[PDB]
A paper describes a structure:
Antibodies to the receptor binding domain (RBD) on the spike protein are frequently encoded by IGHV3-53/3-66 with a short complementarity-determining region (CDR) H3. IGHV3-53/3-66 antibodies carry germline-encoded features that are critical for RBD binding—an NY motif in CDR H1 and an SGGS motif in CDR H233,49,56. Here, we identify two public clonotypes of IGHV3-53/3-66 RBD antibodies with a 9-residue CDR H3 that pair with different light chains. Distinct sequence motifs on CDR H3 are present in the two public clonotypes that seem to be related to differential light chain pairing.
Author numbering:
A (entry chain L): 1 to 95, 95A, 96 to 212
B (entry chain H): 2 to 82, 82A, 82B, 82C, 83 to 100, 100A, 101 to 113, 121 to 220
Write the structure that this text describes.
């Protein structure tokens, strides 16, 4: 089949910028391409078909160009309502076809380092036989952040999960939660629990830690 | 034009489920009609199409298991699913297709969850304000909403009177097949010990309501 890639995967832009994102196809598909917009929790919206035809109802600041293997969607000036994910699609007779991975457009603001908080597991949870340690990275920009768990100054992998919020509507930052999950037995086998945070807002990694008890 | 979907919900692997899409403002007999799904956090997939004169075609991931059909007299589209798999968990959309999979009109989506887990209310644990969650006049506190199924859960704080500084994070699916999420709020350190902070957790699928006071 045909594979589609999009660039960039992430774009940070301001209201009023001209924005150009790109779709490219593993092989010629020559005008069989559409562009859609999707916002979190809604169906996608068709923007452009036949690589260049604007879909009826779609504002004119949107335009598409290209053919063969390389295609481009442009927003000549960006509005608030435009921050969203954008997908390209190869049109096909039969239902497989292809969607690109998407390009997410978020709101540019100044760099802000995370505010970092750590939470030991509750006595109630420990009574259940499980320990969750929670690290919170609050109100940071840009969205890329690295979280490293360390137990007794030693590095963990595979025992944590991460969740990130959508960009905040008031201050345009992100927040991130990391949960380290251990058996009760493992948890009390060890003393120092630490969350080490790396983010372009920080001049060096910052570590928050507690001693069990 | 309007497309209203129904029939999604929780179903066990190996089970069957039938979706409906009730169409207004145009006649499904005279169109290409399509189902398109979207797994949580992932991209779109066109899985089925029914042509004007009743020819049907399927993506190979659903071929042999899913069946697209319509009732002209009811003006409704249907997706019959059999032998469901965990990977079939997704929001399912019906769409008017202008041919070649060009989707100009979309339903609102219906969530289909394919899992072995039983419906289960969450345990709610405090994320207590401490010295390691206080810096300056700001303190972080929250609730860990652990091991529920299925989505969704709602969390408010102080029955909705407290909304500034709240972050309720998207749930993660754990290896267990159960969901966990945290909800945090940042508040004046001055307020601790005199202001009460309760997280109100509501898990409608298990009829579970929890009110957890969180304190230092």
């Amino acid at each position: 089949d045909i594979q589609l890639t999009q660039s960039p995967s992430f774009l940070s832009a301001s209201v009023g910028d001209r924005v150009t994102i790109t779709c490219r196809a593993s092989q010629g598909i020559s005008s069989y391409l559409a562009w859609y917009q999707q916002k979190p929790g809604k169906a996608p919206k068709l923007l452009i078909y036949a690589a260049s035809t604007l879909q009826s109802g779609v504002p004119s600041r949107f335009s598409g160009s290209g053919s063969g293997t390389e295609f481009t969607l442009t927003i000549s000036s960006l509005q608030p309502e435009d921050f969203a994910t954008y997908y390209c699609q190869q049109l096909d007779s039969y239902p497989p076809g292809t969607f690109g991975p998407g390009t997410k457009v978020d709101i540019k603001r100044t760099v802000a380092a995370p505010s970092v908080f750590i939470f030991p597991p509750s006595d109630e949870q420990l009574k259940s036989g499980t320990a969750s340690v929670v690290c919170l990275l609050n109100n940071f920009y840009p969205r890329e952040a690295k979280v490293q768990w360390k137990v007794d100054n030693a590095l963990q992998s595979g025992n944590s999960q991460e969740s990130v919020t959508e960009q905040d509507s008031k201050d345009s930052t992100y927040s991130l939660s990391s949960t380290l999950t251990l058996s009760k037995a493992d948890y009390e086998k060890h003393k120092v629990y630490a969350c080490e945070v790396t983010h372009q807002g920080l001049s060096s990694p910052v570590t928050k830690s507690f001693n069990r008890g | 034009v309007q497309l209203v979907e129904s029939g999604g919900g929780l179903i066990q692997p190996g089970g069957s489920l039938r979706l409906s899409c009730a169409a207004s403002g145009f006649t499904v007999s005279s169109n290409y009609m399509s189902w398109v799904r979207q797994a949580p956090g992932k991209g779109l997939e066109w899985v089925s199409v029914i042509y004007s004169g009743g020819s049907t075609f399927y993506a190979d991931s659903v071929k042999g298991r899913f069946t697209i059909s319509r009732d002209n007299s009811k003006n409704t589209l249907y997706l019959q699913m059999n032998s469901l798999r965990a990977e079939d968990t997704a929001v399912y959309y019906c769409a008017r297709d202008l041919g070649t999979g060009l989707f100009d009109y979309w339903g609102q989506g219906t969530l289909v969850t394919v899992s072995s887990a039983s419906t289960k209310g969450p345990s709610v644990f405090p994320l207590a304000p401490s010295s390691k969650s206080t810096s300056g006049g700001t303190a972080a506190l929250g609730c860990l909403v652990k091991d529920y199924f299925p989505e969704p859960v709602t969390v408010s704080w102080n029955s909705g009177a407290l909304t500034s500084g709240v972050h309720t994070f998207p749930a993660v699916l754990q290896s267990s097949g159960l969901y966990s999420l945290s909800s945090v709020v940042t508040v004046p350190s001055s307020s601790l010990g005199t202001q009460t902070y309760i997280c109100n957790v509501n898990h409608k699928p298990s009829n579970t309501k929890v009110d957890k006071k969180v304190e230092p």
